[PDB]
Design a protein around this ligand. Structure first.
Ligand SMILES: COc1cc([C@](O)(CCN(C)C)[C@@H](c2cc3cc(Br)ccc3nc2OC)c2cccc(OC)c2F)cc(OC)n1
Ligand SMILES: COc1cc([C@](O)(CCN(C)C)[C@@H](c2cc3cc(Br)ccc3nc2OC)c2cccc(OC)c2F)cc(OC)n1
Ligand SMILES: COc1cc([C@](O)(CCN(C)C)[C@@H](c2cc3cc(Br)ccc3nc2OC)c2cccc(OC)c2F)cc(OC)n1
Ligand SMILES: COc1cc([C@](O)(CCN(C)C)[C@@H](c2cc3cc(Br)ccc3nc2OC)c2cccc(OC)c2F)cc(OC)n1
Ligand SMILES: COc1cc([C@](O)(CCN(C)C)[C@@H](c2cc3cc(Br)ccc3nc2OC)c2cccc(OC)c2F)cc(OC)n1
Ligand SMILES: COc1cc([C@](O)(CCN(C)C)[C@@H](c2cc3cc(Br)ccc3nc2OC)c2cccc(OC)c2F)cc(OC)n1
Ligand SMILES: COc1cc([C@](O)(CCN(C)C)[C@@H](c2cc3cc(Br)ccc3nc2OC)c2cccc(OC)c2F)cc(OC)n1
Lengths: 37, 220, 50, 119, 81, 81, 81, 81, 81, 81, 81, 81, 81
């Protein structure tokens, strides 16, 4: 009975997950593969 | 009948957060960082490379070609990692929807909720705005208002398609359920086939549009 | 509840077709890239010993 | 079957054989000729390259200077004020000459550079 | 009453799915018409022609699928009652 | 009452299939236009020209088939009733 | 009453045959326009240009016939009833 | 009231012709635009360009005529009455 | 009774004339475009370019005129009474 | 009673003004597109290009004017009453 | 009653303005396309290209303005009342 | 009773904005096509190609803005009431 | 009563979502048709072609989303009620 197009708090949850995954790749992969090539 | 994309939820800082769509994005993120560990450990340089190594390397050289085609890596290299995650983090975020769970299922993709794509797009928004301010502090002045909606439409557009392109799947997976199970498999099969194409294409265009918006932000 | 039956059956047929079309050719392409880079590093060793 | 390529310079038949594919670059963009193809006449770009691809060998690469292109029923025919193969271009002078200010000689340099794989 | 609104949902919503398919279907034609032709001009350019193709498609199909999203918001979760 | 939502669903399914038909017809037309042109240009490229063809057509047919499915939702499994 | 459904099939059905004809009518045009030019450029191509042509038309005509069928299903079956 | 059916047949049938007119009208233009060009390019080919032309037209006009037929069936017969 | 059928006849005639107008206008435009292009390319060709032109325009204008005819049959002589 | 026919007068007539305007506005835009092209390709030919052009536009504008006339005949004359 | 005539007049004015908008927009687009192309071909030709351009636009724009006029005559001074 | 005039104004604004969006979108598309083609053909022309372009788009966008204006004039300050 | 306005929003607002979806999905195609072709002819031009591309798209998408704005305003915040 609720509208689904409404912003929610999961915004910040997935924001944090994405930020930590961004940091993970930036420290772990890009520079390694870049220097490998 | 068919339910709309409702959710289970829970309150943790006064505001509510959907119970699911956190589990799925969690699975996606952990699989991404897990294959990142796999590659960092098995990164080969001298001998024949593994599948995941060549995979990531092709992705990153594609993104690299794009970025230095737009903005040289010497000036803004950080756009390259930010790009690839936007690709890969999103790619799996859709792929996991192929495996059968339904019976209503909680294994629908993370984009099926608007707030996911909202967070990603607004993050890209503030990132390229910080890029623009970092350089100095359109092509025709008199189109300021379009360039005004340029301010607003980019985070909107980038978000909305990424919702819609995915949300339709989140609906169709239910719709074919209303057909008899002994004949429903074939349209289900075709649609499952097209799911991968549309997910990949949408992630790809999202990443490329991120790159191009960064290029347009840091002009001069 | 036979919706599970239809969904699992669809997954089976699509993974069958995946093993029919997609994975052979993508494995071929990745193995071709592997072959090329291995040949390049072998010629590197050859240049070194020469 | 295959097509017939005949590249004739202004004073000497540069090359002539049979080919599976013929890549070049007209003043209206790149183009690739295949065994059958509509009759066409087109002026190659200032610093054109011509990559012929034979069945049982490697892809011959020819730097052409001053060329025109004519595809007919029989096969392709390229004209050329000067043509230089891949196996004979000196990368040193070719690269050094590219940044010259003289248009014709710079075009020759860019062609010599494309033919050997660089640029 | 309620049924009339429901009708307005099924009619209106249908429009959103009509104007969608006209825009997408024709778009992926006028874009594909430039891909095929390209792969007919240089039969070995296909490899790169995918990067501008699948970009334009990604924009074009957007205008379709966004519509479909709102279509559900009309057909299943009518914002007015 | 049911007849009103019935007529609404019928009109909506009609609109959905009209949009789908226009989109599919003109998209396949403009794609086959480039196919015929490219096969007239390089008759040997036919075997290749199908792979950029059966993508666009493929893509286009998606935006058709979806409509078809949704048409059924409007006609045989009317949402609000 | 029931008449409100009847016209709902006659109107909607009409729509199904409107977007049908705009689909085929233009499609067969934009496809055939690429045949004539082809044949106008080399008459000996009329032999092979029918291989792509009668494919596109095929696809295009499908988009018509389905709608045709559905129009009957709307006018001679009236599903929502 | 029953006469609404008549209106449904008068409106609906109208659509069936309207679409038809946008099918032939443009569908022949886009086709004739090729003939007028082919005959301009290779005049001595006018004799043969009437073989592909009278196929495309021969198809497009069909999509018109059939529509006409059904429009008659809609108005002079009104199947659902 | 009569008023509903009268309004339906008016709207049906409007749809028929709108379809005819779009068809005739755009078909004549796309045909005259090739006419003007052929006249500009080969000036002495005009004398013959009028014979493929005045065929297509015929095939276009017929589609217009017929609709106009039926519009009369829809307005002045409503078949369903 | 009468007022609803008045509605069918303003709506239907409106449609007749709409269709024509889509047929003229694009028609002149396409036919003119050749003029602007031909004159850009061969300025020397301008004088003659106004002869075929003003043919097409004429025909095109005819499709407008007739419809315009009928618009009045719907809004001012109102045949069915 | 008058409000039903009010809704009829409002929908008629909407249709009129929508047709005018589609016509003017696509016509100006197709004409300015040829203008930009002719300017990109021969840079100096711009001066003369504004002679045919502002002709066709002049026609296209007319088909807009007239509609606009008529639209007001529909809503402010409803001819039927 | 106002609700009928309210629905009339709503559908009128919907038609106006839909027509305006179709016109403006397709006009900007067909003009940017020429712009991108000119830049890809004569790249040094990139500077001048903006003086013809921002005419057409300008004109095109007028056709939108006016509609937009009048749309609000139907919705927030309805002429008929 | 209020339902007649509610439906008036769902249809009217719904129309807005179709117009934009036809104005964007085709525009983004007609513009993209340039891009691909450019890249098919001069790959070296790719980097620069994205500059006039995302200008026109920048216009086109706007014409969509402003619509997507007003549609929302029609369905969530119906002004006249
Ligand atoms: C009676 O409804 C149809 C429908 C269809 C199609 O929808 C194509 C319609 N076009 C040709 C006008 C078709 C289809 C769906 C697709 C879906 C995706 Br997602 C991607 C590519 C697709 N490609 C397709 O074919 C090109 C299709 C659908 C279902 C079963 C089918 O098996 C019989 C089937 F063929 C054909 C048809 O023939 C009478 N009747
Ligand atoms: C009054 O209904 C018709 C219909 C038709 C067609 O639908 C063609 C319509 N176009 C010309 C506008 C036709 C058809 C269906 C197709 C279906 C697929 Br799936 C793929 C290719 C197809 N190709 C087709 O022909 C090109 C068709 C259909 C049925 C029986 C038929 O046999 C008599 C038959 F010919 C023709 C017709 O002529 C009086 N009357
Ligand atoms: C009734 O009002 C008309 C109708 C028609 C036509 O329906 C075509 C309409 N177009 C010209 C706009 C026509 C027709 C049907 C076709 C059917 C197939 Br299947 C394939 C090709 C076809 N080609 C056709 O004409 C080229 C036709 C039909 C019946 C008897 C006929 O003979 C008396 C006849 F000519 C012509 C007309 O002339 C003033 N008045
Ligand atoms: C009645 O309102 C009109 C109609 C018409 C026409 O329908 C043309 C309409 N288009 C230009 C918008 C016209 C016509 C019918 C055709 C019929 C076939 Br079957 C084939 C080609 C045809 N070509 C035609 O024009 C070239 C026509 C009609 C009747 C008597 C006529 O002679 C007195 C006559 F010329 C003209 C008009 O005045 C300008 N007023
Ligand atoms: C009153 O609203 C108008 C209308 C009109 C026109 O309808 C043109 C409409 N388009 C340009 C938007 C116009 C017209 C009718 C035609 C009829 C045929 Br049959 C063939 C060619 C025709 N060509 C025309 O113009 C080139 C016209 C109208 C009335 C009397 C006329 O005098 C005989 C007359 F010329 C113009 C206008 O002001 C610019 N205001
Ligand atoms: C009030 O809403 C407008 C309208 C308009 C125009 O209708 C242009 C509409 N297009 C851009 C979509 C415009 C116009 C009418 C024409 C009439 C004929 Br008969 C022939 C050529 C015509 N060409 C025109 O523009 C070149 C116009 C209108 C009135 C006074 C004018 O001043 C004399 C005037 F210029 C412009 C506008 O700008 C804010 N607001
Ligand atoms: C919510 O209303 C808008 C409108 C608009 C524009 O209409 C652009 C619309 N399309 C590009 C999407 C814009 C505009 C109006 C024009 C008017 C004329 Br007469 C000629 C050229 C015109 N060109 C324009 O830009 C291309 C505009 C509008 C109004 C005031 C303005 O202040 C100057 C203004 F700039 C943008 C927008 O973003 C939310 N919202």
């Amino acid at each position: 009975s609720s509208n689904f197009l409404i912003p929610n708090g999961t915004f910040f949850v997935v924001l944090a997950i994405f930020l930590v995954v961004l940091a993970v790749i930036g420290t772990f992969v890009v520079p390694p593969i870049l220097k490998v090539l | 009948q068919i339910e709309v994309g409702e959710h289970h939820t829970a309150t943790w800082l006064g505001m509510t957060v959907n119970t699911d769509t956190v589990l799925s994005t969690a699975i996606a993120g952990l699989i991404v960082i897990a294959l990142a560990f796999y590659l960092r450990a098995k990164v080969t340089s001298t001998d024949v490379p593994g599948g995941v190594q060549l995979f990531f390397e092709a992705i990153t050289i594609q993104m690299r070609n794009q970025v230095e085609s737009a903005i040289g890596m010497r000036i803004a290299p950080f756009v390259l990692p930010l790009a690839v995650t936007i690709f890969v983090f999103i790619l799996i975020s859709n792929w996991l929807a192929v495996l059968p769970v339904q019976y209503t299922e909680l294994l629908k993709s993370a984009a099926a909720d608007i707030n996911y794509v909202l967070a990603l797009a607004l993050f890209v928004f503030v990132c390229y705005h910080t890029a623009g301010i970092w350089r100095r502090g359109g092509h025709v002045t008199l189109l300021a208002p379009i360039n005004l909606v340029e301010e607003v439409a980019k985070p909107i557009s980038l978000s909305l398609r990424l919702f819609g392109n995915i949300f339709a799947g989140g609906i169709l997976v239910a719709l074919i359920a209303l057909f008899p199970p002994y004949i429903m498999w074939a349209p289900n099969a075709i649609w499952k086939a097209f799911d991968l194409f549309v997910g990949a294409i949408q992630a790809f265009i999202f990443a490329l549009l991120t790159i191009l918006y960064f290029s347009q932000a840091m002009e001069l | 509840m036979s919706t599970f039956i239809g969904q699992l059956f669809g997954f089976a047929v699509i993974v069958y077709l995946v093993w029919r079309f997609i994975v052979p050719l993508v494995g071929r392409l990745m193995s071709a890239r592997q072959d090329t880079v291995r040949q390049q590093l072998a010629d590197a060793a050859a240049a070194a010993d020469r | 079957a295959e097509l017939n390529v005949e590249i004739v310079a202004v004073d000497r038949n540069i090359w002539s054989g049979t080919a599976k594919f013929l890549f070049t670059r007209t003043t209206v963009g790149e183009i690739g000729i295949l065994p059958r193809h509509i009759p066409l006449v087109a002026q190659l770009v200032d610093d054109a390259m011509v990559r012929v691809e034979r069945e049982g060998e490697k892809d011959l690469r020819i730097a052409v200077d001053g060329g025109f292109l004519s595809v007919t029923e029989e096969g392709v025919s390229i004209l050329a004020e000067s043509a230089e193969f891949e196996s004979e271009i000196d990368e040193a002078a070719a690269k050094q000459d590219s940044e010259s200010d003289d248009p014709r000689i710079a075009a020759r340099g860019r062609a010599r550079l494309r033919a050997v794989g660089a640029i | 009453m309620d049924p009339t609104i429901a009708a307005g949902a099924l009619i209106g919503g249908g429009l959103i799915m009509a104007g969608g398919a006209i825009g997408a279907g024709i778009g992926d034609g006028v874009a594909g018409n430039a891909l095929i032709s390209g792969v007919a001009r240089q039969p070995e350019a296909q490899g790169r022609l995918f990067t501008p193709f699948f970009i334009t498609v990604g924009l074009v199909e957007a205008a379709y699928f966004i519509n479909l999203a709102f279509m559900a918001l009309f057909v299943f979760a009518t914002p007015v009652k």
